[PDB]
Design an enzyme around this catalytic site. Structure first.
Site, PDB file in Angstrom:
ATOM      1  N   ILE A 199      71.116  39.090  73.766  1.00  0.00           N
ATOM      2  CA  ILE A 199      70.266  40.232  74.177  1.00  0.00           C
ATOM      3  C   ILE A 199      68.867  39.879  74.691  1.00  0.00           C
ATOM      4  O   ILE A 199      68.082  40.767  75.020  1.00  0.00           O
ATOM      5  CB  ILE A 199      70.143  41.236  73.003  1.00  0.00           C
ATOM      6  CG1 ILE A 199      69.445  40.612  71.775  1.00  0.00           C
ATOM      7  CG2 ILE A 199      71.526  41.696  72.561  1.00  0.00           C
ATOM      8  CD1 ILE A 199      68.816  41.681  70.887  1.00  0.00           C
ATOM      9  N   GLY A 200      68.595  38.582  74.805  1.00  0.00           N
ATOM     10  CA  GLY A 200      67.280  38.074  75.190  1.00  0.00           C
ATOM     11  C   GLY A 200      67.442  36.607  75.549  1.00  0.00           C
ATOM     12  O   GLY A 200      68.362  35.915  75.051  1.00  0.00           O
TER      13      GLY A 200
ATOM     14  N   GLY B 138      64.616  33.299  76.676  1.00  0.00           N
ATOM     15  CA  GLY B 138      63.219  32.913  76.841  1.00  0.00           C
ATOM     16  C   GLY B 138      63.108  31.428  77.031  1.00  0.00           C
ATOM     17  O   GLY B 138      64.127  30.693  77.006  1.00  0.00           O
TER      18      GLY B 138
ATOM     19  N   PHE C  12      62.264  28.659  75.423  1.00  0.00           N
ATOM     20  CA  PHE C  12      62.853  27.633  74.557  1.00  0.00           C
ATOM     21  C   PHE C  12      64.119  28.104  73.803  1.00  0.00           C
ATOM     22  O   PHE C  12      64.614  27.380  72.965  1.00  0.00           O
ATOM     23  CB  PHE C  12      61.787  27.082  73.587  1.00  0.00           C
ATOM     24  CG  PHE C  12      60.510  26.584  74.236  1.00  0.00           C
ATOM     25  CD1 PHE C  12      60.444  25.311  74.770  1.00  0.00           C
ATOM     26  CD2 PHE C  12      59.353  27.384  74.289  1.00  0.00           C
ATOM     27  CE1 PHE C  12      59.266  24.819  75.339  1.00  0.00           C
ATOM     28  CE2 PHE C  12      58.158  26.909  74.867  1.00  0.00           C
ATOM     29  CZ  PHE C  12      58.118  25.606  75.386  1.00  0.00           C
ATOM     30  N   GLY C  13      64.670  29.277  74.106  1.00  0.00           N
ATOM     31  CA  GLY C  13      66.015  29.619  73.595  1.00  0.00           C
ATOM     32  C   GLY C  13      66.518  30.995  73.977  1.00  0.00           C
ATOM     33  O   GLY C  13      66.315  31.433  75.098  1.00  0.00           O
ATOM     34  N   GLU C  14      67.149  31.665  73.013  1.00  0.00           N
ATOM     35  CA  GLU C  14      67.705  33.010  73.163  1.00  0.00           C
ATOM     36  C   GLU C  14      67.614  33.874  71.914  1.00  0.00           C
ATOM     37  O   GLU C  14      67.373  33.367  70.829  1.00  0.00           O
ATOM     38  CB  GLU C  14      69.166  32.907  73.601  1.00  0.00           C
ATOM     39  CG  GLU C  14      70.082  32.133  72.661  1.00  0.00           C
ATOM     40  CD  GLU C  14      71.461  31.869  73.260  1.00  0.00           C
ATOM     41  OE1 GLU C  14      71.580  31.488  74.448  1.00  0.00           O
ATOM     42  OE2 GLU C  14      72.453  32.058  72.549  1.00  0.00           O
ATOM     43  N   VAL C  15      67.835  35.176  72.093  1.00  0.00           N
ATOM     44  CA  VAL C  15      67.869  36.169  71.011  1.00  0.00           C
ATOM     45  C   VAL C  15      69.284  36.737  70.960  1.00  0.00           C
ATOM     46  O   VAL C  15      69.800  37.204  71.979  1.00  0.00           O
ATOM     47  CB  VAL C  15      66.865  37.317  71.197  1.00  0.00           C
ATOM     48  CG1 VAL C  15      66.898  38.271  70.001  1.00  0.00           C
ATOM     49  CG2 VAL C  15      65.448  36.771  71.337  1.00  0.00           C
TER      50      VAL C  15
ATOM     51  N   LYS D 229      66.489  35.022  66.612  1.00  0.00           N
ATOM     52  CA  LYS D 229      65.859  34.290  67.703  1.00  0.00           C
ATOM     53  C   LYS D 229      66.028  32.814  67.432  1.00  0.00           C
ATOM     54  O   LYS D 229      65.659  32.337  66.358  1.00  0.00           O
ATOM     55  CB  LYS D 229      64.376  34.621  67.783  1.00  0.00           C
ATOM     56  CG  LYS D 229      63.572  33.825  68.809  1.00  0.00           C
ATOM     57  CD  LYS D 229      62.144  34.401  68.903  1.00  0.00           C
ATOM     58  CE  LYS D 229      61.254  33.529  69.791  1.00  0.00           C
ATOM     59  NZ  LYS D 229      59.886  34.044  69.951  1.00  0.00           N
TER      60      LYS D 229
ATOM     61  N   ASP E  93      48.756  37.421  75.094  1.00  0.00           N
ATOM     62  CA  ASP E  93      49.833  37.913  75.985  1.00  0.00           C
ATOM     63  C   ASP E  93      50.429  39.280  75.587  1.00  0.00           C
ATOM     64  O   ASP E  93      51.622  39.397  75.308  1.00  0.00           O
ATOM     65  CB  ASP E  93      50.915  36.836  76.073  1.00  0.00           C
ATOM     66  CG  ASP E  93      52.023  37.150  77.060  1.00  0.00           C
ATOM     67  OD1 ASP E  93      51.763  37.769  78.117  1.00  0.00           O
ATOM     68  OD2 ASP E  93      53.166  36.743  76.741  1.00  0.00           O
TER      69      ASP E  93
HETATM   70  C1  LIG Z   1      60.280  30.436  73.946  1.00  0.00           C
HETATM   71  O1  LIG Z   1      61.519  30.900  73.394  1.00  0.00           O
HETATM   72  C2  LIG Z   1      61.843  32.228  73.418  1.00  0.00           C
HETATM   73  C3  LIG Z   1      63.129  32.604  73.057  1.00  0.00           C
HETATM   74  C4  LIG Z   1      63.498  33.936  73.068  1.00  0.00           C
HETATM   75  C5  LIG Z   1      62.586  34.904  73.439  1.00  0.00           C
HETATM   76  C6  LIG Z   1      61.302  34.541  73.800  1.00  0.00           C
HETATM   77  C7  LIG Z   1      60.307  35.598  74.206  1.00  0.00           C
HETATM   78  C8  LIG Z   1      60.342  35.776  75.724  1.00  0.00           C
HETATM   79  N1  LIG Z   1      60.648  36.866  73.557  1.00  0.00           N
HETATM   80  C9  LIG Z   1      60.745  36.937  72.214  1.00  0.00           C
HETATM   81  O2  LIG Z   1      60.548  35.948  71.535  1.00  0.00           O
HETATM   82  N2  LIG Z   1      61.097  38.257  71.548  1.00  0.00           N
HETATM   83  C10 LIG Z   1      61.375  39.616  72.408  1.00  0.00           C
HETATM   84  C11 LIG Z   1      62.683  40.228  71.897  1.00  0.00           C
HETATM   85  C12 LIG Z   1      62.586  40.462  70.384  1.00  0.00           C
HETATM   86  C13 LIG Z   1      63.725  41.306  69.859  1.00  0.00           C
HETATM   87  C14 LIG Z   1      64.779  41.719  70.667  1.00  0.00           C
HETATM   88  C15 LIG Z   1      65.788  42.490  70.124  1.00  0.00           C
HETATM   89  N3  LIG Z   1      65.765  42.837  68.852  1.00  0.00           N
HETATM   90  C16 LIG Z   1      64.784  42.464  68.053  1.00  0.00           C
HETATM   91  C17 LIG Z   1      63.739  41.693  68.527  1.00  0.00           C
HETATM   92  C18 LIG Z   1      62.557  39.123  69.639  1.00  0.00           C
HETATM   93  C19 LIG Z   1      61.231  38.402  69.928  1.00  0.00           C
HETATM   94  C20 LIG Z   1      60.930  33.212  73.791  1.00  0.00           C
END
Ligand SMILES: COc1cccc([C@@H](C)NC(=O)N2CCC(c3ccncc3)CC2)c1
Ligand SMILES: COc1cccc([C@@H](C)NC(=O)N2CCC(c3ccncc3)CC2)c1
Lengths: 366, 384
Positions: A74-75, A77, A79-82, A97, A190
């Site tokens: 669902i995400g 970014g 350095f990884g994924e959500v 995450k 940010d």
């Molecule tokens: C550098 O590595 C990364 C890896 C993944 C993500 C990211 C950055 C871009 N976004 C987050 O960290 N987020 C946003 C979505 C949040 C969420 C989404 C659904 N449900 C609950 C929370 C979790 C925190 C950076």
């Protein structure tokens, strides 16, 4: 006498030598040594042969990624994924995450996660996405959070023309969330709609704190204090009401140049309507740092006339009805998240390297 | 919690290798093997060190350390260190503290013996074993804080007394029970001798120095040992696979030294002694001047046979009913709670008069790469 004081330090979960940290210290040690190359040193091989058996047991018992079922990604970014996940045992649903260890080492930046973890673990704030569990394995860090099924505000703004009533609300919730992050002695930097999520009841929580320290949305000064978050609030309000960001450009260099020139480069499109109060407030956030709104605390923001409605008060806003309550099919409805598209680990080393060392202490069970 | 109960069990068990003390050793050990300006050239290390730097320097302050004790006199010297009479500065209590050089143990690659020694002294709950109170470590040494035994060893006893047979019945019986306890723990001593036999405040036996104790395999066997006189023949031919009966040999040798005055295979050279032990069938005769009962003669001969028909193969009980041990003074169940032959009279809480005086150090190289010198000492630390 002393040994009370010592056992205090081991029981405090804010302390870097809690029991979780000490076990990280052990697993980290073993992983950075157990290579047939380094077992040529006898010291190592003895030690490893002792702990070999017990460490393989520990891993079984500690929280690990095989404890969860992945439902959907669902995400994504830097350095990884959500991941949307279900705890196999408890059946509960979380957002998890992931962060590649390889990537974090490789690309310079591998401290950000400490504040992120601590914020989410220990804010006791309903403006912050709560962290339940942090753990690690050979390859990744993991952060298990309350899932926010309402999605980000990008996803909101793309699906709704947003009236001023709605923006009063969502902005107010942001100014409250930041004030809490400020109360914790942190600057976000940010602040943006991608980092603003919506709970089961369509109310705000913040997530992604990679930037917290003790382009369109960036302030001139950044290109130095908390006021830079408040800039980003002005930018947000504008994007909601207008539709575009107030320093949009084709290039990035264009955007930068516009932000610097903000005194001249800000006008409000005459085709979008917006109240005087709302205009005034945006301009109050988009000044030079020295006279920007929120320098002199949060309260001057809160009494700004814009925020007057006969709907909510500042003390009770989060306990009122949200503008957009999501309608959700199941405990796994990720309809407010767009679908996602699509790994290298470390070299086996010759000598000792210590790749796991900057991840000792991460693990946290609430 | 299904699993996380089981996990928290392992951390609370002080027999477990990941008790809290062990995990902190794991931390201190790590830092010590890394904090050299050479290895801080690696960024990973330097970051980690800069985080823990501050907390580790605090920990060291709080944990037990050698500066917590005052050294009174040195009372023992051995292969890899010395034994100190010490006073805990804070509590004012007096202990015996045994030190082991880490450098020396690594260098001369015997560096496992201390595990059984520690465990035995920590966890026997036996009044035949010298109890361990605290184990700890520094950069340089391991330390073992024990109940001081102010009556001294039996060498020091035998040198100061012509020893009657009544006394030897007693001291031997106490040895028999002590070994049976070590045997009950699934260990073979190997190096049983008067130097490793000490006397408490009430002149009753406790065993110390377990550097030689090795754990039995599934049958009851095991694969240098000891001083020569007290060693058994079978031990000398593995040394070219042996069981518990080799301890019982050494008991025979002991009884003989007490009653006769000399060891039964004395020689000028060591080679002489060895040769005699092998030839024991011929080389054991009793000096005709020496005062000794038939029962006592018989018992010594029962211990000094070949392994296959030696006394104590078939458990302790056959030893205990041997006629020699009949007196109207003690019973086997109550011996240690009777009056000892020689109760020491002591001037102060630090009277080491029953210990002979002693005469009077190189550490590791600063390494270039990672070395892990502290790794075989993780888990040692123990607070009772
Ligand atoms: C550098 O590595 C990364 C890896 C993944 C993500 C990211 C950055 C871009 N976004 C987050 O960290 N987020 C946003 C979505 C949040 C969420 C989404 C659904 N449900 C609950 C929370 C979790 C925190 C950076
Ligand atoms: C191989 O390294 C070593 C280092 C030091 C000592 C030794 C050996 C020779 N002897 C012990 O270990 N002993 C005997 C005295 C005991 C005692 C003396 C007074 N009070 C209580 C106990 C303590 C244990 C060997």
């Amino acid at each position: 006498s002393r040994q009370r004081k010592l056992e205090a330090l081991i029981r405090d979960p804010r302390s870097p030598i809690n029991v979780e940290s000490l076990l990280d210290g052990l697993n980290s040690l073993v992983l950075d040594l157990d290579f047939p190359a380094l077992r040529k040193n006898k010291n190592i091989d003895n030690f490893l042969n002792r702990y070999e058996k017990i460490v393989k047991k520990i891993r079984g018992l500690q929280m690990k990624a095989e404890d969860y079922d992945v439902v959907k990604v669902i995400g994504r970014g830097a350095f990884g994924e959500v991941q949307l996940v279900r705890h196999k045992a408890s059946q509960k649903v979380y957002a998890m995450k992931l962060l590649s260890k390889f990537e974090m080492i490789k690309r310079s930046d591998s401290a950000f996660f400490w504040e992120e973890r601590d914020i989410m673990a220990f804010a006791n704030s309903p403006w912050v996405v709560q962290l339940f569990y942090a753990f690690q394995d050979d390859r990744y860090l993991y952060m298990v959070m309350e899932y926010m099924p309402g999605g980000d505000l990008v996803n909101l703004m793309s699906n709704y023309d947003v009236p001023e009533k709605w923006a009063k609300f969502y902005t107010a919730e942001v100014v409250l969330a930041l004030d809490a992050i400020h109360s914790m002695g942190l600057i976000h930097r940010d602040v943006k709609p991608d980092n603003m999520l919506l709970d089961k009841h369509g109310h705000l929580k913040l997530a992604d704190f990679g930037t917290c320290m003790k382009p369109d949305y960036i302030s001139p000064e950044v290109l130095y204090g908390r006021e830079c978050d408040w800039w980003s609030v002005g930018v947000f309000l504008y994007e909601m009401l207008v539709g575009d960001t107030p320093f949009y450009a084709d290039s990035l260099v264009g955007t930068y140049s516009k932000i610097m020139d903000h005194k001249n480069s800000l006008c409000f499109p005459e085709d979008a309507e917006i109240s005087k109060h709302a205009k005034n407030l945006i301009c109050a956030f988009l000044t030079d740092r020295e006279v920007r709104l929120g320098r002199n605390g949060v309260e001057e923001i809160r009494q700004h006339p814009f925020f007057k409605n006969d709907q909510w008060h500042w003390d009770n806003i989060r306990e009122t009805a949200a503008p957009v309550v999501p309608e959700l099919s199941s405990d796994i409805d990720s309809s407010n998240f767009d679908d996602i598209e699509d790994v290298e680990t470390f070299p086996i080393p010759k000598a000792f390297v210590g790749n796991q060392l900057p991840f000792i202490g991460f693990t946290y069970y609430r």
